[PDB]
A paper describes a structure:
CISs are macromolecular injection devices with an overall structure that is homologous to the contractile tails of bacteriophages. Their conserved modules include an inner tube, a contractile sheath and a baseplate complex. For firing of the extended apparatus, the baseplate undergoes a conformational change and triggers sheath contraction, which in turn causes the inner tube to be expelled and injected into a target. Here we performed structural and mechanistic studies on a clade Ib CIS gene cluster in the marine bacterium Algoriphagus machipongonensis PR1.
The spike is located below the tube initiator complex and comprises three intertwined copies of Alg8. The N-terminal part of Alg8 forms a gp27-like domain and functions as a 3-to-6-fold symmetry adaptor. The gp27-like domain is followed by the mid β-barrel domain and C-terminal gp5-C-like domain, which are homologous to T4 gp5. Intriguingly, the gp5-C-like and mid β-barrel domains in Alg8 twist an additional 120° around the central axis and are much longer when superposing the gp27-like domains against homologues in PVC/AFP. Interestingly, our symmetry-relaxed map showed an additional prominent density plugged into the tube-exposed cavity of the spike. We identified this density by structural modelling unambiguously as a trimer of the uncharacterized protein Alg6, hereafter referred to as the ‘plug’. Alg6 includes an N-terminal single strand and a C-terminal α-helix, which are linked by a flexible loop. The Alg6 N terminus extends along the inner surface of the Alg8 gp27-like domain, then folds back and forms the C-terminal α-helix. The hydrophobic core of Alg6 contributes to the trimeric assembly, directing the hydrophilic surface to interact with other baseplate components. There are extensive contacts between Alg6, Alg8 and Alg7, suggesting that Alg6 is essential and functions as a nucleus for particle assembly.
Numbering used by the authors:
A (entry chain I): 701 to 750
B (entry chain H): 601 to 1024
C (entry chain H): 201 to 400
D (entry chain q): 365 to 581
E (entry chain r): 437 to 581
F (entry chain s): 365 to 509
The structure:
Amino acid sequence: QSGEIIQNQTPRFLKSGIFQFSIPKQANLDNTVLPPGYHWIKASMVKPFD
Amino acid sequence: SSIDFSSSSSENQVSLIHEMPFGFQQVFTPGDTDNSLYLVPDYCHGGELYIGLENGKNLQQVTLLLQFLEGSENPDITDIFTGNQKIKWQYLSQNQWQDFQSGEIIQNQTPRFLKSGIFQFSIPKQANLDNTVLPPGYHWIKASMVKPFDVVSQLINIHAQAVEAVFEDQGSSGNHLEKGLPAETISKLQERLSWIKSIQQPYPSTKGKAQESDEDYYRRVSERLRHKKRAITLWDYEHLILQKFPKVYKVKCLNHTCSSSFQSPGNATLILVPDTVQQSVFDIYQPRVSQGTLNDVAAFVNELNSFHVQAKVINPNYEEVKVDVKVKFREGLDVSFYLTKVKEDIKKFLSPWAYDQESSVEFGVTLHRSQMIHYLEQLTYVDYITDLRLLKRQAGSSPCNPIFIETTEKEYIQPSNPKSILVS
Amino acid sequence: VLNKTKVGQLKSLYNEISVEKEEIKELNTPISTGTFVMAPMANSFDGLGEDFPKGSEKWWPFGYTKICNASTVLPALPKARLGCSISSKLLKLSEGTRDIILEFTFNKPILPNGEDYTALNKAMSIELTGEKGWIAGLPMTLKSDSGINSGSKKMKLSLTLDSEQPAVVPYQTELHEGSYEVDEPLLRVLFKTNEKEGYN
Amino acid sequence: PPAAGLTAAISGLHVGLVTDLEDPDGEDRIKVKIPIINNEEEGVWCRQAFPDAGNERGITFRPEIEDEVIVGFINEDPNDAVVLGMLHSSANPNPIEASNDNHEKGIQTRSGIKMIFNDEKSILQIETPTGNLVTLDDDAGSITIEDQNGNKTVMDSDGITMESAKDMNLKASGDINLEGTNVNIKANAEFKAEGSAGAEVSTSAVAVLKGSLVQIN
Amino acid sequence: FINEDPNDAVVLGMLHSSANPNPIEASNDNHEKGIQTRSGIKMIFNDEKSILQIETPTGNLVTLDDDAGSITIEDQNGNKTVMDSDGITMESAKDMNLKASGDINLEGTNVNIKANAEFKAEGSAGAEVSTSAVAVLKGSLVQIN
Amino acid sequence: PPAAGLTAAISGLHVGLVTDLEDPDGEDRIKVKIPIINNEEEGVWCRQAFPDAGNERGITFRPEIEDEVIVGFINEDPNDAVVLGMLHSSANPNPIEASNDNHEKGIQTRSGIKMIFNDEKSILQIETPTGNLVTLDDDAGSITI
């Protein structure tokens, strides 16, 4: 949500920098699609890998 | 098997138990007789609040602080504890409720749950920790009312072991006096004693006042020389109250207003708006004045009006429209100057009219030109193509058919009273 | 004087009545006659433990019965749990086809309009203590010979268990999850206070 | 100069009282009052010495709130205090009575769990407050294990005895083998024996089957 | 230091610090006390629950528990003995051998012996099965001598 | 001034010998000689420090008559002596042989009752002088009584 990302200095992964966010309420440690015990965050792209 | 519950000399071999909202009770055991049994518990009309206490003893005193949010009650009820009516108290013993005796209540500063205060009592002998109608291990105390649920104020909390204390005036500068001491500034005694594990300060301090400044001295003297301490016209009423009552932010005098009329001679209505700066307590989107102030204000002025005129003092009963707009042409960043941040700033600007807060704009109740200037001044903005602020006709919570503010108004209040034009 | 007495728990109830009892002629009245609700945790947001949202902590000392109020919208409170239970040896039933009949007699007549078994099934719910916990649901529907005659002082209830059902057993605190001082089987009946028939 | 010349020094050892066991800065310190300085305020944070300590190991016991302790000072500085041990007095009696024979030694906790060594009789006894105990006794030549419910196992000069308060269940995933000179099985109600792959009773001398009625297949 | 002489030093005790943490977490309730060595062998006293537990690093333990009313002895191989309110239970991971140089005497209200494969009983000087009520011998085939 | 100016003070720590364990005035004191003052007379009553002590609880061991102990002094006053611990020497050897590997730790009493912790092999053994023992051994995977 809009209040959960504080800053993103690396919007297109081209330069070094800081990403900052809060852990959202309802984040879940007990899942099955990815190993349990961790909070999980996903980044995604639909462009060629390079 | 066949059982006559009233007959002696009969093998009444059945056990009967009643199920209750928070527990149960054994009613009839095998071998018993009775004359009056029911299948169900008897709950009469009204409301009940149960307080369970831990680790007391049967002859100790208990002091309780009830912290209310003053003014948060329904103003439109006619059954309001007239005469000598009040809230009743009882304690639990052997699954029965019993009245307190005259020597068991020490004081009650909150007889009708309208204002914050102390309740102090001793734990009665025969108080019981082992019960079934309510969970065991606690002493239980009951409060009750037979009136609609909103005739009392909403609560914030209840605390045991409360102690009252006061600022000592010494040769220093009482800067904290205009706006009181903030919550949680106090944690220790002057000499830290060994037996005290700890001290807490949940709410802001209250009732203090700093010495007059030169600016206030001149202001006060100058007005008395004009109004002569009489409440005759509009200015007189509005300035007499702001000088007399220090925790009123805005005032409005209504020349011919009665609850059912805006053209009745021989009367007047006054509307009071509090500051509510300490938002840790107050609901800043529904600020209200408590009964204490509403009544004190009425008494003060009615003595100064005229033999023939009584004034009424009410809450504004706020209602208001809200803005929507074209996206900003610029922002510092999608996060740093997120539309949500802009929304928060807009809410603060309007909130400052509804309740005390800072705002550069003269008023919330203004044309879009004022709103545009307020936004243009931001260090993270460039332009916006369009904006509007009609009343929320689509507000489902407050019933539909609600009036809208579409007809080119500069955010005019919906009404002379029962309106604010300060949504936030 | 300071000591260790602490506030441990806060609970609340409310019973609001609109219609005088003398006007109840049948269970399915055209108008609601009253409302009963409870809060197991009076000082929580929904009455059950949900945290108050950051902006404000406020609660009603004696609950509430309407969802939309002067300025906001609150979650509904659960309705009050009311009922009773019966315990006796005749319920020790382990196999075969089981048919259980209960008859109830009072000092006064019950109603000017008697009631069908389909009316009673909208007003009450019945459970038994069995081998794997409480026996509940469809197997505990009242049968067609139950009911209340119009001028009578007697109410009749009727239940049956298939040969495929678990045995009915004496109450055990470690199995039936409670705290009753009962050494026999239990039959528990609760009123469906959510419905007009149950409340009436 | 004493305490590096930076503060008044404190000489010798002093006696203090424990007021707080939870250290706000994680150094495992305890807060102690020193009555010859001030017996009313909270006190200062002191380090505690243990008979054995290291990285995630050691022998750990801590004083209770209001226990009396003996305190030393590093470089005689009043704010480098170290707790060296705990003291007894008539206000806080020693659970083991003094004697010049010195026969009894051991550990006794707050809840009543004991572990006692008796030298005179060569006895080691471990026991909880409601009767669960294990005893090694050289003056009996035996080992006893006993619980609070009446179950008991004893190994002594007469062999091994086991008794149960209610029932007894012996199970194995493999074979069960019993041996002895004379095997005697008795029941006060019923005796049964089964085998899914057969059963056999045999002897080199005389087999006997008796009852008030004997049935075969 | 004896007589404040730098070469008459005496060690009085060992210290803990954040660089060398105390294995038992501090609390004003002070419920847990005990011994823990380098290799992980523990002996812990729990006052709140009146429990004494002795345990090695790979599961060999003895526990005395007043909050259960029981005594448990258990090894790392799955063998276990428990004394509690239901009597005495013994279980073996693999097998069980009971031997005596003298007599073996079993008693109880009801004695029940079961085997999932075979049951045998022998005596070099004879054997006997008896009862005051009814003796029963059954099988798909019964052979006598 | 030292020892409040009321008496000659005694600095540092000193070594003494135990002569009497029965305190005539009930304060749980022990009588100790200090050889650098006088090694022939009876000595003075000293308080004893313990690793754990409180109201009817603690870990209690007392020195034997003629054991050697280390003594401190409150406010450097010769008659406020406190016993801080016991010492070993070649005249009174330590039952567990020293090694830089430090594998063996434990308790051994006067009569020969032992409780020994072996870290190298993860073994806990409790044993009395005439063969009664309980052993927990992770190098065998077994429990023996």
